[PDB]
């Protein structure tokens, strides 16, 4: 299911790389995603637009699984599918709350 392809896609990825690719675009609710461990979910960086005084914040939300039917990934004991890119395809189209649902998958 390797994702390893999706513009917010970033493999062996950490939260400061995500942040470091996304504050070199600087976009709306920036989306992310980086390979973890855990149960076997993926990572997701989320960055918010802004610089000035602040205002840019880079979120990296993680795709938490659930053996559902299929529903296992989420990021908010909500939505859940088989797959970032679901995951991610649902924040970035429906409303998955998220800095702003899958607004751009940043690829670093």
């Given at each position: 299911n390797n994702l390893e392809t999706y513009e917010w896609y970033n493999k062996s990825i950490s939260r400061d790389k995500a942040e470091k690719l996304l504050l070199d675009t600087?976009?709306?609710?920036a989306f992310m995603v980086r390979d973890s461990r855990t149960p076997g979910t993926y990572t997701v960086s989320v960055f918010t637009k802004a610089i000035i005084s602040e205002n840019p914040c880079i979120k990296h939300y993680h795709i938490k699984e659930t053996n559902?039917?299929?529903?296992?990934?989420?990021?908010?004991?909500?939505?859940?599918?088989?797959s970032i890119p679901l995951l991610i395809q649902y924040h970035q189209y429906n409303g998955g709350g998220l800095v702003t649902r899958l607004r751009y998958p940043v690829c670093g």
């Open positions: 600087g976009k709306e609710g559902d039917s299929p529903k296992r990934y989420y990021v908010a004991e909500k939505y859940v599918f088989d």
